[PDB]
Amino acid sequence: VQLVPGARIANGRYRLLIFHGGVPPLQFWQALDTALDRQVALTFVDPQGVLPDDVLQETLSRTLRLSRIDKPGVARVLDVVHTRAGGLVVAEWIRGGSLQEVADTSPSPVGAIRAMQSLAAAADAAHRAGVALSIDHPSRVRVSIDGDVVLAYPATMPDANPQDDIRGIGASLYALLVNRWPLPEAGVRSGLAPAERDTAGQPIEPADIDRDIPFQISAVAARSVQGDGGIRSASTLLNLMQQATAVADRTEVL
């Protein structure tokens, strides 16, 4: 079939508006719910049917498992339906902007790390619940008006794991900090340039690229983005985020 703006999906209930990219076979869409007249976040799980039913089923399952976690870091799942275009994960629409859009406004460092805490925290409840967020691509998250960073398009496939979440979270923090995506790219419609690599392949640290960025805040970004090691828990990740914040509010004025 075909997915393009205007399409009507699910007995026509949803009309597509904007394509927000994804990591195939996933597709992140912005759509209008014509029965309740309000926007929703569609995650299509497999438009072309390329997935073995076994993987599909595990994907819905882990997504559902993620759904019952109620934290501001994750969009609320409204439904999970099978449509003419494959499995479909319907989520509330988060007012604000994409992760791409906000980073292009070189936002305050302190404002950025502070806003990431909702993401790290939701990560933590998830992991403690045995399910990953799958922060694998910048389109996956938005920034809400209320200054939270949110998993907008839920859809947790088999490959998603806690450790990749920590990496993906920092890859977001990094994005806000330097408007660059320090991860290889497994995407369509990424919208963000790649991060400069040092000689050892590790991304150049945020502070070195812009010495205005407090040291603590650039540390949490880099020690997190590298799967090399260091941070190995949303739990710890959050606390680092929090200490980095306190140091920063104090020092902020100066």
Side-chain angles (χ1 to χ4, degrees), residues 1-227 229-254:
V1 186
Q2 291 189 27
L3 292 190
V4 295
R8 274 76 178 191
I9 283 73
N11 294 270
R13 177 161 182 189
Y14 304 106
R15 178 197 198 120
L16 289 191
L17 306 173
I18 306 193
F19 177 69
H20 282 259
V23 185
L26 296 193
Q27 280 182 41
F28 305 148
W29 281 89
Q30 180 177 0
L32 171 63
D33 182 337
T34 71
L36 283 38
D37 200 21
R38 83 202 167 169
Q39 286 194 145
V40 291
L42 296 189
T43 308
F44 288 94
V45 171
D46 182 14
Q48 296 103 356
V50 294
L51 300 183
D53 291 337
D54 165 64
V55 180
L56 172 57
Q57 301 295 348
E58 192 58 21
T59 292
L60 302 177
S61 284
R62 294 164 177 258
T63 297
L64 289 180
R65 182 132 80 263
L66 174 62
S67 80
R68 24 192 167 267
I69 285 191
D70 185 30
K71 313 234 69 189
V74 190
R76 179 212 301 278
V77 180
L78 295 169
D79 219 350
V80 171
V81 296
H82 291 275
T83 69
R84 188 142 186 257
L88 182 54
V89 173
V90 180
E92 67 180 329
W93 179 261
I94 303 288
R95 302 181 65 259
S98 61
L99 174 69
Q100 299 78 7
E101 284 170 334
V102 160
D104 200 20
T105 73
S106 308
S108 152
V110 174
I113 177 163
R114 167 170 296 154
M116 286 289 310
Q117 301 183 22
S118 52
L119 199 50
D124 182 43
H127 300 167
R128 295 185 77 197
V131 60
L133 292 185
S134 191
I135 303 320
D136 47 35
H137 176 287
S139 273
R140 277 275 208 168
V141 298
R142 287 165 74 68
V143 191
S144 77
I145 50 184
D146 290 301
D148 270 339
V149 175
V150 195
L151 177 65
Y153 307 87
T156 294
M157 306 198 57
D159 51 80
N161 64 90
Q163 187 61 35
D164 284 339
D165 275 11
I166 276 88
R167 306 184 73 252
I169 286 180
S172 288
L173 167 55
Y174 193 105
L176 293 180
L177 285 185
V178 204
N179 201 20
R180 312 283 169 127
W181 191 252
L183 298 181
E185 168 96 346
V188 186
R189 208 89 163 213
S190 188
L192 292 187
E196 305 291 326
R197 297 302 171 175
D198 65 359
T199 297
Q202 289 302 320
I204 305 182
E205 311 206 4
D208 298 331
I209 315 178
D210 167 21
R211 69 170 62 196
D212 289 338
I213 301 174
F215 175 57
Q216 296 300 318
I217 296 178
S218 174
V220 162
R223 271 194 62 196
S224 152
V225 156
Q226 81 188 181
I231 319 177
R232 291 180 172 178
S233 83
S235 169
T236 299
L237 175 56
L238 188 56
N239 295 165
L240 270 59
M241 282 202 193
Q242 299 178 324
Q243 317 171 343
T245 277
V247 159
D249 312 2
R250 296 166 182 168
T251 303
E252 194 161 0
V253 65
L254 310 166

